[PDB]
């Protein structure tokens, strides 16, 4: 499988640096441009520059040539892309791509956030109907900073699922999620809701049990 | 540098009609070796870009031929046949003729499906958070459209509305409508004063409010 693989997030603060980096699997690192992409919350795809693995030429958008830094390590088959001295207007999400022939193959992306403050787990509780369908749901409340990932029953139960985006209100984040069966399904089967919140590097699980 | 222009920020669509979407380029980008160093990619929200067409006019592999990419050197066409609730979410034509490597600024897809009114579920306190302190009620006003909608919390039948939280989300993959997620936060003391909770949902699929409620002590 051709893939890159990206931490999901980085939290970084005001001033310093940052180094994101790319590992490569699934076919032959030096052989193929590794191209990084920036996206803040909401906008447009950039183009930050590239380079050759094997040889480590590089190519810059002169936007970026004072705020980037492009190298790889051929001997883990890894991309790096430096970023110095971050401000709020660098927040954002940054992407690495590879272009294999005519096709592009992309990371996840890793969340870049600036910010003085310290990460903070989420507490996640689930949400059992009060004491045809059933809903149930889970609050992933006060973590900081984003992301979190959120499946039920490790991704095996997906339809009838809503996942809301992630709402700042005095500083920490607030998602929750829900997802409706049929009655006569629950509780006799399980439902778990599995939450990961990567800047922390937990990953908790709750069982929706009835009230 | 070569500019890629989409002129078009959004463009909405019923399911089931074809659709085009526009990007311009502000120099032919038609190789003297005969590509055309034209890509589109969708991007889902939450998810990395995914491609659609390479060199200007072929099918990726993977991908639903009701999906097509024309063009002349400098004006190019993205046309999707028969659009479905998978299908929402932005484009973006990106040019690799030339260095800088530019992208447009994307097209956003909308669906305008069918109106329906919202289902709403509502969730006291966790038996943990109550123990941990806090307390917060939840409701899910799920699977509506059109996007607009408003939610009243009642405690004890009088509005409130500080520790409010609400969260739409995107049109769903499936059956591209919306839902909304709103959480009233309070401390346990404030929650274990009072007795009855309600959320009041109005959307304009109906004059009266859909709601549940639900009394503490019951
Ligand atoms: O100097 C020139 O004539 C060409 C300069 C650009 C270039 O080398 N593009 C290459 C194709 C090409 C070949 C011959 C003529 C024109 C274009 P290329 O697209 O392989 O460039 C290498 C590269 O890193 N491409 C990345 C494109 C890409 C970027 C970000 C996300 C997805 C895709």
């Known amino acids: 499988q051709v893939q890159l693989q990206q931490p999901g997030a980085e939290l970084v603060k005001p001033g310093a640096s940052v180094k994101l980096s790319c590992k490569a699997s699934?076919?032959?690192?030096?052989?193929?441009?590794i191209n990084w992409v920036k996206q803040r919350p909401g906008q447009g795809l950039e183009w930050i520059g590239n380079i050759y693995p094997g040889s480590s030429y590089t190519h810059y958008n002169e936007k970026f040539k004072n705020k980037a830094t492009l190298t790889v390590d051929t001997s883990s088959s890894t991309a790096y892309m430096q970023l110095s001295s971050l401000t709020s207007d660098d927040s954002a999400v940054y992407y690495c791509a590879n272009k294999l022939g005519w096709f592009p193959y992309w990371g996840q992306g890793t969340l870049v956030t600036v910010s003085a403050a310290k990460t903070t787990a989420p507490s996640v509780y689930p949400l059992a109907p009060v004491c045809s369908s059933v809903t149930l749901g889970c609050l992933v409340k006060g973590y900081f900073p984003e992301p979190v990932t959120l499946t039920w029953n490790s991704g095996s139960l997906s339809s009838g699922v809503h996942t809301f985006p992630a709402v700042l209100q005095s500083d920490l984040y607030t998602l929750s999620s829900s997802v409706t069966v049929t009655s006569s399904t629950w509780p006799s089967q399980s439902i778990t809701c599995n939450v990961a919140h990567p800047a922390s590097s937990t990953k908790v699980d709750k069982k929706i049990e009835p009230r | 540098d070569i500019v890629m222009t989409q002129a078009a920020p959004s463009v909405p669509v019923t399911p089931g009609e074809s659709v085009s979407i526009s990007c311009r380029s502000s120099k032919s980008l038609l190789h003297s070796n005969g590509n055309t160093y034209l890509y589109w990619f969708l991007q889902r929200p939450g998810q990395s870009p995914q491609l659609l067409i390479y060199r200007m006019s072929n099918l990726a592999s993977g991908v639903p031929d009701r999906f097509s990419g024309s063009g002349s050197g400098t004006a190019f066409t993205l046309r999707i046949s028969r659009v479905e609730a998978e299908d929402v979410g932005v484009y973006y034509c990106?040019?690799?003729?030339?260095?800088?490597?530019?992208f447009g600024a994307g097209t956003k897809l909308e669906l305008k499906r069918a109106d329906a009114a919202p289902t709403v579920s509502i969730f006291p306190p966790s038996s943990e958070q109550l123990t941990s302190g806090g307390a917060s009620v939840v409701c899910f006003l799920n699977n509506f459209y059109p996007k607009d909608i408003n939610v009243k919390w009642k405690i004890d039948g009088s509005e409130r509305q500080n520790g409010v939280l609400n969260s739409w989300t995107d049109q769903d993959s499936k059956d591209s409508t919306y839902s909304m997620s709103s959480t009233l936060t309070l401390t346990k003391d404030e929650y274990e004063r009072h007795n009855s909770y309600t959320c009041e949902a109005t959307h304009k699929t109906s004059t009266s409010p859909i709601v549940k409620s639900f009394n503490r002590n019951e």
């Open positions: 699934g076919y032959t690192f030096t052989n193929y441009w």
């Open positions: 990106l040019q690799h003729l030339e260095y800088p490597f530019t």
